[PDB]
């Protein structure tokens, strides 16, 4: 996350850490048993980290648990982003309390200017490279449709969104690929991606979740 704030542990209880001997993507809790991320954030033997602040120290408030299963979207397009989503198991469930907690789905897509929490990890820096080992915060707007096809035109998607500033200087990119966009209580986003990072008149670029409710519902419900 470039240009934001440190959240203060435990304040987002629903971020994920996915690691595979590091911290490698975000992700977020959606009830005890499942997590949702970014399906370029698919590898093989994930370790799903609950309750983290300092992913480097052991601060006490943490679930380490295996995941037992990965879901890529069908219809995930590796080369354009579009259907960036993956639904990932937990072996076991997770314990929810105060810092553990699940994020309700949208019954609704979310409207341009409505101000959402992106949340994650990664790279704090817009040219050259810095990895804080705190969660740290972004809020955003949710951008209209036209000034995010504007920014990468025939790029966008109906299954993508923009959020953040056109000026550049905030915004997530390698600052937590899978992690969330929380926006009036639901989980409306997943970072995917967006070139550069907080570059004037590139926004980053966001998995709509709104659009893909029925398929979560189902897939949890018969895996
Ligand atoms: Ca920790």
Same mark, same amino acid.
């Given at each position: 996350?470039?240009?934001? $704030? ?8 629903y *971020?994920?850490?996915? !690691? ?10 959606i ?22 602040? =300092?992913? !480097? ?5 943490e ?9 890529v ?5 590796? !080369? ?8 990932? /198991? ?6 929810? =309390? ?16 409505? *101000?959402?929490l ?6 704090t820096?817009?040219?050259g490279?810095? $990895?804080?080992?705190?969660? /740290?915060?972004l /809020? ?11 920014? $990468?035109?025939? *790029? ?8 953040? $500033? ?30 550069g ?8 670029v966001?998995? /709509?979740?709104? =659009? ?12």
């Amino acid at each position: 996350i470039v240009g934001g $704030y440190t959240c203060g542990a435990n304040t987002v209880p629903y *971020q994920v850490s996915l !690691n595979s001997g590091y911290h490698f993507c975000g992700g977020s809790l959606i009830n005890s048993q499942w997590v949702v991320s970014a399906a370029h954030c698919y590898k093989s033997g994930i370790q799903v980290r609950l309750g983290e602040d =300092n992913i !480097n120290v052991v601060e006490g408030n943490e679930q380490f648990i295996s995941a037992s299963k990965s879901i890529v979207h069908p219809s995930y397009n590796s !080369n354009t982003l579009n259907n960036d989503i993956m639904l990932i /198991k937990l072996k076991s469930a997770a314990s929810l =309390n105060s810092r553990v907690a699940s994020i309700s789905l949208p019954t609704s897509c979310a409207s341009a200017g409505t *101000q959402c929490l992106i949340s994650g990890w990664g790279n704090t820096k817009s040219s050259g490279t810095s $990895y804080p080992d705190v969660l /740290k915060c972004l /809020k955003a707007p949710i951008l209209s449709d036209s000034s995010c096809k504007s920014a $990468y035109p025939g *790029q966008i998607t109906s299954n993508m969104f923009c959020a953040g $500033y056109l000026e550049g200087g905030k915004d997530s990119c390698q600052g937590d690929s899978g992690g969330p966009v929380v926006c009036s209580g639901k989980l409306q986003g997943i970072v995917s991606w967006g070139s550069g990072c907080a570059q004037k008149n590139k926004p980053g670029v966001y998995t /709509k979740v709104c =659009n893909y409710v029925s398929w979560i519902k189902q897939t949890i419900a018969s895996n």
